Enzyme design. Structure first.
Site, short mmCIF file in Angstrom:
data_model
loop_
_atom_site.label_atom_id
_atom_site.label_comp_id
_atom_site.label_asym_id
_atom_site.label_seq_id
_atom_site.Cartn_x
_atom_site.Cartn_y
_atom_site.Cartn_z
CD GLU A 1 42.66 42.83 36.69
OE1 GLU A 1 42.13 43.03 37.76
OE2 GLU A 1 43.07 44.05 35.75
CG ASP B 1 39.85 39.64 39.16
OD1 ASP B 1 40.44 40.89 38.84
OD2 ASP B 1 40.50 39.46 40.20
CE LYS C 1 40.24 41.02 46.34
NZ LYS C 1 40.21 42.11 45.31
MN LIG Z 1 41.41 40.34 41.77
MN LIG Z 2 40.56 43.12 39.37
#
Ligand SMILES: [Mn+2]
Ligand SMILES: [Mn+2]
Length: 176
Positions: A61, A89, A115
């Protein structure tokens, strides 16, 4: 706007600039989508915090797509961990798995279900943080020691209280 001003007060310039780059990557004006701007800053900061606990973590990320997929491909080529469908991430070099970080204004279990249903990979580890000090992780493996998770939760709660002090929290929490 008060929300844009808060974002520039509470986050460091590097995080704000990365967040503006992401907002442009999906063509979004941070002066208009101010709650998304703040959420983007918060997620960036949590990921960078999470990584500072190595060495142990590689940050995906906060990179441009080209370099993010470059890092992911290099990791998969040197570890044999399978390539995720979606940009994760972080990568955990100790557990040797990718981590998807979630920060939610809702119940941690609802966002975890969202998610998990999206990523649809039993390989990418999910770790959800709330602004209330709650957390939920795949298999209840919270990856980090309690001190590191404590500092993340303190920072998130602090962001919430700063919003509240400016009467910005109700808007932010009802936005998704
Ligand atoms: Mn995330
Ligand atoms: Mn991400």
């Amino acid at each position: 706007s008060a929300m844009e001003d808060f974002v520039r007060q509470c986050f460091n310039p590097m995080i704000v600039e990365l967040a503006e780059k992401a907002m442009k990557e999906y063509g979004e004006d941070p002066k208009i989508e101010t709650n998304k701007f703040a959420a983007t800053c918060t997620h960036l900061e949590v990921c960078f915090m999470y990584s500072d606990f190595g060495h142990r973590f590689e940050i995906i990320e906060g990179r441009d797509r080209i370099m993010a997929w470059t890092v992911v491909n290099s990791i998969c080529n040197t570890t044999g961990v399978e390539k995720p469908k979606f940009l994760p991430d972080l990568y955990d070099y100790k557990e040797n798995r990718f981590i998807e970080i979630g920060v939610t204004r809702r119940e941690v279990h609802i966002y975890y279900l969202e998610k998990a249903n999206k990523i649809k990979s039993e390989k990418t580890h999910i770790h959800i943080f709330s602004f209330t000090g709650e957390e939920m992780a795949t298999k209840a493996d919270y990856t980090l020691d309690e001190e590191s998770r404590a500092r993340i939760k303190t920072r998130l709660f602090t962001i919430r209280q700063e919003m509240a002090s400016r009467s910005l929290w109700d808007s932010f929490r009802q936005s998704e």
